[PDB]
Amino acid sequence: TKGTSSFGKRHNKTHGLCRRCGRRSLHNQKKVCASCGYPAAKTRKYNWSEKAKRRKVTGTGRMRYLSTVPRRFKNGFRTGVPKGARG
Amino acid sequence: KAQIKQALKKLYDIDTVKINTLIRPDGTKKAFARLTPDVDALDIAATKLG
Amino acid sequence: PSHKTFRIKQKLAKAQKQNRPIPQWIRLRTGNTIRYNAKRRHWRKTRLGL
Amino acid sequence: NGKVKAGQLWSKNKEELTKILGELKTELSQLRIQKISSSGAKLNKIHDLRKSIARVLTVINAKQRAQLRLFYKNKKYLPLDLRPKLTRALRRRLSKEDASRVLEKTKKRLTHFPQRKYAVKA
RNA sequence: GUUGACCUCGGAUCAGGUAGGAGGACCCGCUGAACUUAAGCAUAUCAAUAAGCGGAGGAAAAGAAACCAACAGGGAUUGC
RNA sequence: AGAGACCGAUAGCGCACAAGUAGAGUGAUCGAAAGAUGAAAAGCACUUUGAAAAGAGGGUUAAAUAGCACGUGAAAUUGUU
RNA sequence: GCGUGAGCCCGGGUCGAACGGCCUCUAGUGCAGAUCUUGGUGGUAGUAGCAAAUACUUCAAUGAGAACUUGAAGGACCGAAGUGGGGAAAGGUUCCAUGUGAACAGCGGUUGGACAUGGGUUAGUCGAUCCUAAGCCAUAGGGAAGUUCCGUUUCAAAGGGGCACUCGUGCCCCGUGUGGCGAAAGGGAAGCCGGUUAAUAUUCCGGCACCUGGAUGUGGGUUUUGCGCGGCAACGCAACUGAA
RNA sequence: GAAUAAUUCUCACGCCAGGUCGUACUCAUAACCGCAGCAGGUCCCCAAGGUGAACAGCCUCUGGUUGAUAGAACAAUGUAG
RNA sequence: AAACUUUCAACAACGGAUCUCUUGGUUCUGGCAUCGAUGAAGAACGCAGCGAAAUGCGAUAAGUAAUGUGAAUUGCAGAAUUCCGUGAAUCAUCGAAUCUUUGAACGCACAUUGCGCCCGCCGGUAUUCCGGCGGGCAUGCCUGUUCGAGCGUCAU
Numbered sequence: 001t002k003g004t005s006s007f008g009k010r011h012n013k014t015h016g017l018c019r020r021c022g023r024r025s026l027h028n029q030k031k032v033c034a035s036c037g038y039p040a041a042k043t044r045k046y047n048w049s050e051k052a053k054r055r056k057v058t059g060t061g062r063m064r065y066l067s068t069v070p071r072r073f074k075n076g077f078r079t080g081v082p083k084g085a086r087g
Numbered sequence: 088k089a090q091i092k093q094a095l096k097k098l099y100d101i102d103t104v105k106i107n108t109l110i111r112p113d114g115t116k117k118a119f120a121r122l123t124p125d126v127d128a129l130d131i132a133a134t135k136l137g
Numbered sequence: 138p139s140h141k142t143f144r145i146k147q148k149l150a151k152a153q154k155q156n157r158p159i160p161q162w163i164r165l166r167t168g169n170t171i172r173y174n175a176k177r178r179h180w181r182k183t184r185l186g187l
Numbered sequence: 188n189g190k191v192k193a194g195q196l197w198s199k200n201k202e203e204l205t206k207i208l209g210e211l212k213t214e215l216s217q218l219r220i221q222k223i224s225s226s227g228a229k230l231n232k233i234h235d236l237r238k239s240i241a242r243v244l245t246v247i248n249a250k251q252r253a254q255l256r257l258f259y260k261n262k263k264y265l266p267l268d269l270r271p272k273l274t275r276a277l278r279r280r281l282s283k284e285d286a287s288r289v290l291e292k293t294k295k296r297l298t299h300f301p302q303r304k305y306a307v308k309a
Numbered sequence: 310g311u312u313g314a315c316c317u318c319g320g321a322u323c324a325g326g327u328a329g330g331a332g333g334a335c336c337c338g339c340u341g342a343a344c345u346u347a348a349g350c351a352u353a354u355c356a357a358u359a360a361g362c363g364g365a366g367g368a369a370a371a372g373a374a375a376c377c378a379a380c381a382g383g384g385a386u387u388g389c
Numbered sequence: 390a391g392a393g394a395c396c397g398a399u400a401g402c403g404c405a406c407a408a409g410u411a412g413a414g415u416g417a418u419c420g421a422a423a424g425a426u427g428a429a430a431a432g433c434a435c436u437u438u439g440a441a442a443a444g445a446g447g448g449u450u451a452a453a454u455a456g457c458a459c460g461u462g463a464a465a466u467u468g469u470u
Numbered sequence: 471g472c473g474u475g476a477g478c479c480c481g482g483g484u485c486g487a488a489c490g491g492c493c494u495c496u497a498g499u500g501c502a503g504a505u506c507u508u509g510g511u512g513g514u515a516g517u518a519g520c521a522a523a524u525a526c527u528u529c530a531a532u533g534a535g536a537a538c539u540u541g542a543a544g545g546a547c548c549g550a551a552g553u554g555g556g557g558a559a560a561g562g563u564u565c566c567a568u569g570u571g572a573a574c575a576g577c578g579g580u581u582g583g584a585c586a587u588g589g590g591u592u593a594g595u596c597g598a599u600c601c602u603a604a605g606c607c608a609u610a611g612g613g614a615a616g617u618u619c620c621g622u623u624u625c626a627a628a629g630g631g632g633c634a635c636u637c638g639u640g641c642c643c644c645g646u647g648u649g650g651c652g653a654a655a656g657g658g659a660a661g662c663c664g665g666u667u668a669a670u671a672u673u674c675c676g677g678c679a680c681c682u683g684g685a686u687g688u689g690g691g692u693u694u695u696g697c698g699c700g701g702c703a704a705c706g707c708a709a710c711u712g713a714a
Numbered sequence: 715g716a717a718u719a720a721u722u723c724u725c726a727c728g729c730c731a732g733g734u735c736g737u738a739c740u741c742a743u744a745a746c747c748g749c750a751g752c753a754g755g756u757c758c759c760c761a762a763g764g765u766g767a768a769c770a771g772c773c774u775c776u777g778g779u780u781g782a783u784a785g786a787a788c789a790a791u792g793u794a795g
Numbered sequence: 796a797a798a799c800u801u802u803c804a805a806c807a808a809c810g811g812a813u814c815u816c817u818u819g820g821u822u823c824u825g826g827c828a829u830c831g832a833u834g835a836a837g838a839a840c841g842c843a844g845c846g847a848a849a850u851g852c853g854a855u856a857a858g859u860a861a862u863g864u865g866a867a868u869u870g871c872a873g874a875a876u877u878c879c880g881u882g883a884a885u886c887a888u889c890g891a892a893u894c895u896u897u898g899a900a901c902g903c904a905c906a907u908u909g910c911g912c913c914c915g916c917c918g919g920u921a922u923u924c925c926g927g928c929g930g931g932c933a934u935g936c937c938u939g940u941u942c943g944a945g946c947g948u949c950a951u
């Protein structure tokens with residue numbers, strides 16, 4: 001009766017939605033994410049998988065703050081306004 | 088509901104007796120406001136609103 | 138089930154606002170290559186993971 | 188109309204800016220309320236109105252910060268958002284005064300034996 | 310007896326500060342294999358390598374002799 | 390940022406395209422296919438048969454032996470003569 | 471047409487933007503096989519088959535088209551441990567109305583859980599929220615090169631209650647003990663009847679109630695020697711001071 | 715704490731307020747899991763008349779279905795009776 | 796003699812080889828040194844006159860200010876400027892701002908849009924109750940301040 005009959009009894013959930021990475025990988029009883037390692041302070045990452053590292057490395061998101069640093073560096077991290085501007 | 092009641096009074100100068108709310112399947116909130124019986128809702132919907 | 142939490146309710150709302158065809162005027166722009174919607178989902182075909 | 192221009196905003200105090208902001212706000216709400224059951228040339232007025240609101244908020248904010256910076260001039264401690272933001276590492280560096288100090292003994296040596304300007308003939 | 314010191318140990322949403330995470334191609338350490346070769350196999354080899362852990366920068370590390378030599382003596386470190 | 394006795398869409402990176410996307414797995418993880426109308430849409434007005442999809446005329450174009458199932462259009466396999 | 475041969479050259483048709491001969495240089499350079507890799511296509515073949523769960527028939531209407539669409543009339547099955555009326559887990563709009571070429575419903579289709587456009591979920595009383603269970607994790611401390619392992623009251627200086635404030639600042643008591651998460655079936659304050667929509671209702675409308683918290687005034691009760699009377703009794707009565 | 719008023723009287727009546735999230739529909743020979751509109755699997759509440767010891771089998775009421783590709787013929791060999 | 800099977804050609808099918816093309820890869824060489832508690836990298840939810848995705852942005856939301864240029868955007872529509880001066884644009888540049896819920900993530904928690912405490916202002920008869928608004932409350936360690944403990948210990 002292993003197989004088709006036993007497959008009918010599957011109506012529970014081992015994993016739920018993680019609060020940090022968003023995948024359905026948070027273990028319900030252990031309360032530990034199988035993907036990012038929440039709630040540890042560091043993020044889970046291993047060198048035996050290069051594919052997994054590249055799926056979430058820097059640059060795969062929005063870069064909301066880090067993408068404006070090269071422009072500020074080139075101009076010397078200056079402050080002020082251009083000469084006789086209005087306002 | 089406490090914020091809805093104060094806003095309607097400030098905006099249109101209307102009074103209510105009770106307010107019911109729900110959240111729609113599309114993620115937005117809809118509120119039912121019942122006026123005091125001495126004011127006609129049909130009149131308000133024409134003077135204010137449209 | 139009728140018992141839901143607010144996080145699951147929020148997810149279900151977004152999944153059905155993302156399930157409409159493309160407007161007609163998109164297909165008449167210069168240098169267009171989009172024909173249809175390639176991410177259409179149906180409750181009888183593919184299961185969304187929560 | 189419903190389209191204000193930043194040129195005239197810069198020459199006003201806060202009282203005018205606040206009441207202009209209020210008048211712009213009520214008008215935008217009314218057009219939203221009566222937006223349904225019709226459609227026409229009022230459709231672009233809402234776009235002009237919400238952009239006009241952004242301009243007034245910007246001018247109010249800028250005039251406030253200028254006054255605050257004048258207040259904290261010649262003070263030892265300033266609020267965090269008025270302090271310069273260079274970079275975390277750039278903010279921890281030794282100041283130029285401290286990084287260029289020397290001992291008494293090495294200073295006396297530079298007074299009497301610095302590098303010289305010289306040439307060697309062929 | 311009163312009062313005043315010293316030493317050690319504590320409280321405070323006391324005044325002012327500072328660390329964690331990301332990145333890790335290259336750099337400084339710790340810990341640590343087996344497949345394989347020996348026509349078998351245990352010392353050996355693969356290798357003071359892969360995987361695991363901690364710490365930095367535009368370079369890091371090393372560095373002004375308790376050195377090399379045995380000469381008619383050289384003279385901090387690094388690289389070809 | 391500049392280049393090459395490199396590859397030319399089953400090649401070159403898994404990805405020349407809304408690609409680490411769609412999809413599979415409880416999970417760690419696995420992971421594609423898919424480029425080319427014409428110089429210019431000038432992307433077929435009107436009449437007629439049909440319930441409609443469409444057909445027959447008639448038009449545009451250098452070309453429809455280029456009609457969006459779109460450059461060229463091989464073989465396996467199939468229809469008529 | 472040429473060459474022993476691998477091959478080379480020309481005529482006819484289709485087509486639309488680049489290509490060759492000779493001497494040197496260079497290589498990811500020559501396919502029938504690997505139960506070879508990717509893609510495409512045959513014979514078999516209009517073949518095997520589309521046979522559990524008793525079953526359909528007449529008239530009319532719609533429509534290009536009706537066995538499996540709608541009305542009426544007959545004939546039947548489920549037979550209250552139901553093919554009935556409601557829920558928990560799981561799904562996520564599948565719910566309602568209007569309309570519709572193709573594709574899907576292994577026959578058909580004017581019908582659809584399919585396709586297009588709009589609409590729909592109303593609470594102080596039903597739940598969650600509060601409590602703890604098996605269990606999980608912080609704090610004091612001890613291991614481990616380290617990611618971290620143990621430890622839950624311990625070999626710890628571990629709390630909370632009141633009063634005025636000129637106005638917070640100031641006074642005075644008690645002390646053995648001192649965190650959180652964990653149940654939509656355990657524990658637990660409080661709502662019933664009638665009506666209403668295409669689609670919600672113990673939630674909307676009408677009538678009639680209840681619980682908790684907070685302020686407070688009338689009536690009544692007690693006290694002229696201060697905090698109620700009655701009954702042998704079991705006890706009764708609208709009240710009828712009470713800190714550590 | 716009273717002798718003219720006092721009463722921190724658990725008595726009657728009277729004043730004010732009660733925030734936040736779920737609520738549609740199915741729960742299965744088509745809305746869940748088995749690659750699917752699969753004779754499999756998946757926790758509960760309500761429970762009529764007759765025969766009969768009876769929630770046995772058999773017939774009926776309320777409620778619900780008439781849905782599983784069809785038409786014609788009756789050879790061998792089969793499956794079921 | 797037809798039909799059927801088989802072979803070749805023309806035209807018509809099925810399928811996407813071949814030829815030519817390329818806003819893409821790959822390898823080498825040269826220049827530079829800049830993330831974060833002043834809240835990063837990553838995640839979620841929203842924002843357009845008509846948008847599902849992709850790109851951009853954050854309730855000031857398909858963007859605001861400032862500087863330069865000098866007449867557009869374009870699938871449709873409307874409207875604005877039309878270069879006087881008060882200036883088109885998904886333009887270029889970028890020194891001033893805004894920046895939802897989270898995340899090392901910080902009042903305690905979180906499978907909950909759950910439950911608290913302190914200070915101030917505004918309403919409801921109110922220091923104590925209810926509602927709205929603004930500002931706050933994690934841990935380890937350093938320097939300083941102030942309040943303390945101990946017959947550890949000095950003098951009087």
Ligand SMILES: [K+]
Pocket residue numbers: none
């Ligand atoms: K101290």
Ligand SMILES: [K+]
Pocket residue numbers: 334
């Ligand atoms: K590399």
Ligand SMILES: [K+]
Pocket residue numbers: 047361
């Ligand atoms: K490692």
Ligand SMILES: [K+]
Pocket residue numbers: 403
């Ligand atoms: K590929």
Ligand SMILES: [K+]
Pocket residue numbers: 186
């Ligand atoms: K999946």
Ligand SMILES: [K+]
Pocket residue numbers: 451
């Ligand atoms: K020509």
Ligand SMILES: [K+]
Pocket residue numbers: none
């Ligand atoms: K022609």
Ligand SMILES: [K+]
Pocket residue numbers: 455460
């Ligand atoms: K052609």
Ligand SMILES: [K+]
Pocket residue numbers: none
């Ligand atoms: K030819």
Ligand SMILES: [K+]
Pocket residue numbers: 516
């Ligand atoms: K057939």
Ligand SMILES: [K+]
Pocket residue numbers: 523
């Ligand atoms: K049957």
Ligand SMILES: [K+]
Pocket residue numbers: 547
């Ligand atoms: K039946």
Ligand SMILES: [K+]
Pocket residue numbers: none
């Ligand atoms: K409630």
Ligand SMILES: [K+]
Pocket residue numbers: none
């Ligand atoms: K009420």
Ligand SMILES: [K+]
Pocket residue numbers: 598735907
């Ligand atoms: K809840």
Ligand SMILES: [K+]
Pocket residue numbers: 599
């Ligand atoms: K609550």
